[PDB]
Design an enzyme around this catalytic site. Structure first.
Site, PDB file in Angstrom:
ATOM      1  N   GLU A 292     142.008  86.417 108.999  1.00  0.00           N
ATOM      2  CA  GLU A 292     141.433  86.148 110.314  1.00  0.00           C
ATOM      3  C   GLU A 292     142.382  85.332 111.183  1.00  0.00           C
ATOM      4  OE1 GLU A 292     138.640  87.539 111.338  1.00  0.00           O
ATOM      5  OE2 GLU A 292     137.763  88.218 109.452  1.00  0.00           O
TER       6      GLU A 292
ATOM      7  N   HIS B  91     129.099 102.033 109.154  1.00  0.00           N
ATOM      8  CA  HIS B  91     129.936 102.497 110.259  1.00  0.00           C
ATOM      9  C   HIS B  91     129.462 103.833 110.821  1.00  0.00           C
ATOM     10  CE1 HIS B  91     132.418  99.754 107.804  1.00  0.00           C
ATOM     11  NE2 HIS B  91     132.927  99.377 108.964  1.00  0.00           N
TER      12      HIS B  91
END
Ligand SMILES: *[C@@H]1O[C@H](CO)[C@@H](O)[C@H](O)[C@H]1NC(C)=O
Ligand SMILES: *[C@@H]1O[C@H](CO)[C@@H](O)[C@H](O)[C@H]1NC(C)=O
Ligand SMILES: *[C@@H]1O[C@H](CO)[C@@H](O)[C@H](O)[C@H]1NC(C)=O
Ligand SMILES: *[C@@H]1O[C@H](CO)[C@@H](O)[C@H](O)[C@H]1NC(C)=O
Ligand SMILES: *[C@@H]1O[C@H](CO)[C@@H](O)[C@H](O)[C@H]1NC(C)=O
Ligand SMILES: *[C@@H]1O[C@H](CO)[C@@H](O)[C@H](O)[C@H]1NC(C)=O
Lengths: 198, 596
Positions: free
Chosen positions: B357, B487
């Site tokens: 991240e 998804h």
């Protein structure tokens, strides 16, 4: 004030102590063009122009002779032959609120670049196209002044910076804004070199 | 005056107001995520409606500038991005129906709760109730029950919804001058107007097949090894000649194979590289984890985190009174505001996630000089790939020894490298045929190659052919087995993981060649190398201003995605798997030989 409507204060007939400003730790930029800070406290000038405004962090570099950008072309233009100092400091504590401070504006569009030390406070709709605007912000006709959205959680390149530009000029009139000359403790009854008022 | 100057002024009155509205919307989303309260939900919805209405008005105003009278490539790229209708070309009734379908799929997926018939007094949700069962159970019929019951409920709810979804998305895509919705998704990689570096929507499927044909032997050997180990774990269910049963892969759908590392470990007797206990003994806070990650990013030459990052990020779970999303997310809020929302624990996984991240944050910081509508990755693969390369580099034992987390007298022999590479293959290589099969199936559904009555007969045929996974019992057309995944049920592209996986090892080879590493590729660490960071930052600073082919030329020196770095990364493991598969049979049979 906003950068499109930058405040100009004319400073005359007083004593200007520049060492108070130079020795302060509260200023991030103290870039002087055309003069050095060490001899400011010695030299004397006819008038001092103090222009004050607020810009972004990334736009402080544009307050310089010969620069190019939105602020230089459309908001505040400095001459190439400029004598004076540009002092800037971060003001995220004062000029940013959690909801967003939208009291500061910047002229985003103008037909031509500004002359040095020019103020444009016109609120006429910019005509980017051949069609007449007729006073309405429609297609190809955009409002010139766009607000800044200052918030305290912003990055250092977007935080508000208060900029004061001091312009020093010498004109054929007698220069009256002089620095504070010091006074060495008078010594009597000895052969000394005296300098009393020149 | 001219059309180009008009478009430039319009793009500036877009950019300036857009950055601030996207900021307001992103801050509302952040305040929702760190504080789940109904007024924050209302503020988020109001900001999102303002953002969508502003995008609608600028799309309505951008189309009045014709494309062929503009010669500057960046201005034409921003105008091409802005002039997309999206769902606006579709009628208001059908757009509302599509939005309603998307919202009800979101509610069905989020609030789907399934438990055993005749015991209905309490039930388990997917996360974490079913995830732990799928990842840790060793019982055949319990996993079979959970798998079949969750695909029964979710598929029988979602099948008419998906049948409406494909028709509405095809209508929207053909209204936008595309062949299908698959062509709309493949248009993200479309490069037009650059001499030599042009990339077509039809070239993407050919490149994916060309890379997967070279993927296939390594995956066949890995599948044979996993088949032999699962035959050892489960004696009678798995056949030597057939495919793997679907509910035994360690996850709910087969997305990752990383939960089979305990069952399929080569050398259990040898130790692991677990550094968790070492951080617990030295009392490493999450702040120390992020500071070590920042030390890693300053060692390669990238810029360090802002003061506002340390002030404004939430790197610890707030408490019982305040609710927050536990998923790690890097936020580019706009205007130089970069934050990480992660409930960081003292684990190796959270440390690698912190590096990943913060790589996302570095990528977001790099294109801050770009205009607002160009502030993205060159494609969807690069944005994840630049985090995955940090996850690769941080996981090395050299990095752990350098930061003091590993003992300096730790013996790095070949067996630990083999089992580490096998774990990385189960995580990374195993998702590739599933991703390729899912995207190819969705492309054939949108293209109309597969009729609605023949979706599943082809699909399991694809899974046997590509993934080498057999259905436990046959499924009819009342099931909707793909849409149980997040998804596909929520309208997300899925080829980003495939492109991310290949770009990951391409970037890894490029930076390790830049850093002059002289050993194996998996032994390579990109710390202490200023030139590797400069080569990375040259591509990172571009953002979406340049084509992804030109960016790939800037990094690796190639004009196309390549499969050879992945095979070079796993080459010791490939030789070891070829040695271990002498007695066993590589490859599978598409027949029903294990179970049906
Ligand atoms: C979260 O929301 C609650 C709602 O009353 C509020 O009391 C609290 O101060 C908020 N916390 C933060 C960190 O915003
Ligand atoms: C395209 O426009 C950008 C500003 O939007 C400008 O900086 C760049 O030089 C232009 N490129 C060409 C080739 O004119
Ligand atoms: C968007 O839709 C309008 C109206 O149907 C159409 O005129 C325009 O060409 C469309 N935009 C593109 C890029 O096709
Ligand atoms: C980032 O690095 C610079 C120079 O090395 C340093 O002055 C600055 O304090 C660092 N930022 C933080 C947040 O530590
Ligand atoms: C590891 O190295 C030792 C010593 O060279 C050798 O005996 C062993 O076969 C090797 N194992 C693998 C998997 O390469
Ligand atoms: C990278 O540089 C730091 C700074 O001295 C050093 O402590 C570290 O050991 C170096 N890395 C390696 C692998 O030597």
């Amino acid at each position: 004030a906003s950068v499109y409507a930058w405040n100009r204060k004319r400073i005359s007939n007083c004593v200007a102590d520049y060492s108070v400003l130079y020795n302060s730790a509260s200023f991030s930029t103290f870039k002087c063009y055309g003069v050095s800070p060490t001899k400011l406290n010695d030299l004397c000038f006819t008038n001092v122009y103090a222009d004050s405004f607020v810009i972004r962090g990334d736009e402080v570099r544009q307050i310089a002779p010969g620069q190019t950008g939105k602020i230089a072309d459309y908001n505040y233009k400095l001459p190439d032959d400029f004598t004076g100092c540009v002092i800037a400091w971060n003001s995220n504590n004062l000029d940013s609120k959690v909801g967003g401070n939208y009291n500061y504006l910047y002229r985003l569009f103008r037909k031509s670049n500004l002359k040095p030390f020019e103020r444009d406070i016109s609120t006429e709709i910019y005509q980017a196209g051949s069609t007449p605007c007729n006073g309405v912000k429609g297609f190809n006709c955009y409002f010139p002044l766009q607000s800044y959205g200052f918030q305290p959680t912003y990055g250092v390149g977007y935080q508000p910076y208060r900029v004061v530009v001091l312009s020093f000029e010498l004109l054929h009139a007698p220069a009256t804004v002089c620095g504070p000359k010091k006074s060495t403790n008078l010594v009597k009854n000895k052969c000394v070199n005296f300098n009393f008022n020149g | 005056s001219t059309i180009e100057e008009q478009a430039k002024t319009f793009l500036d009155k877009f950019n300036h107001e857009a950055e601030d509205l996207f900021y307001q919307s992103s801050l509302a989303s952040w305040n929702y995520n760190t504080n789940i309260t109904e007024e924050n939900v209302q503020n988020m919805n109001n900001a999102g409606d303002k953002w969508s209405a502003f995008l609608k008005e600028q799309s309505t105003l951008a189309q009045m500038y014709p494309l062929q009278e503009i010669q500057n490539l960046t201005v034409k790229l921003q105008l091409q991005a802005l002039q997309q209708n999206g769902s606006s070309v579709l009628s208001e009734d059908k757009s509302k129906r599509l939005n309603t379908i998307l919202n009800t799929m979101s509610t069905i997926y989020s609030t789907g709760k399934v438990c055993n018939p005749d015991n209905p007094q309490e039930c388990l949700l997917l996360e974490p109730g079913l995830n732990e069962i799928m990842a840790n159970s060793l019982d055949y019929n319990e996993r079979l029950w959970a798998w079949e019951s969750w695909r029964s409920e979710v598929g029988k709810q979602l099948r008419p919804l998906y049948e409406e979804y494909v028709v509405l998305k095809n209508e929207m895509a053909r209204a936008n001058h595309y062949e299908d919705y698959g062509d709309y998704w493949r248009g993200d990689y479309e490069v037009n107007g650059v001499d030599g570096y042009d990339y077509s929507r039809g070239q993407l499927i050919e490149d994916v097949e060309h890379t997967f044909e070279e993927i296939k032997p390594l995956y066949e050997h890995l599948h044979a090894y996993v088949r032999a180990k699962l035959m050892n774990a489960y004696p009678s269910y798995i056949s030597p000649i057939g495919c793997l049963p679907a509910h035994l892969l360690g996850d709910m759908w087969g997305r990752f194979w990383t939960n089979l590392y305990s069952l399929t470990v080569p050398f259990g007797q040898k130790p692991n590289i677990d550094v968790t206990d070492a951080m617990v003994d030295q009392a490493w806070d999450a702040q120390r984890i992020f500071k070590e990650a920042e030390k890693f990013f300053v060692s390669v030459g990238l810029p360090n985190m802002t003061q506002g990052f340390w002030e404004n990020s939430m790197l610890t779970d707030p408490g019982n009174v305040q609710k927050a999303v536990c998923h790690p997310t890097a936020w580019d809020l706009g205007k130089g505001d970069f934050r990480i929302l992660m409930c960081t624990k003292v684990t190796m996984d959270d440390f690698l996630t912190a590096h990943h991240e913060m790589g996302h944050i570095q990528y977001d910081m790099a294109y801050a000089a770009q205009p607002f509508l160009l502030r993205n990755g060159a494609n969807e693969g690069f944005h994840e790939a630049v985090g995955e390369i940090m996850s690769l580099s941080a996981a090395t034992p050299k990095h752990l020894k350098s930061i003091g987390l590993l003992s300096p007298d730790f013996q790095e022999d070949n067996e630990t490298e083999i089992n580490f590479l096998l774990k990385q293959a189960l995580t990374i290589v195993g998702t590739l045929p599933f991703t390729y099969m899912l995207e190819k199936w969705r492309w054939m559904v949108f293209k109309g190659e597969i009729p609605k009555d023949q979706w599943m007969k082809k699909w399991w045929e694809m899974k046997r052919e590509i993934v080498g996974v057999v259905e436990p019992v046959p499924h009819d057309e009342t099931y909707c087995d793909p849409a149980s995944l997040f998804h596909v049920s929520n309208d997300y592209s899925f080829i980003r993981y495939y492109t991310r996986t290949l770009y990951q090892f391409q970037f890894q080879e490029a930076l390790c060649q830049a850093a002059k590493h002289e050993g194996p590729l998996h032994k390579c660490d990109i710390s202490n190398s200023t030139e590797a960071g400069q080569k990375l930052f040259n591509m990172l600073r571009l953002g979406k201003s340049e084509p992804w082919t030109l960016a790939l030329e800037n990094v690796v020196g190639a004009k196309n995605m390549n499969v050879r770095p992945l095979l070079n990364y796993f080459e010791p493991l490939f030789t070891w798997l070829k040695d271990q598969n002498k007695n066993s049979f590589v490859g599978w049979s598409t027949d029903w030989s294990p179970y049906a």
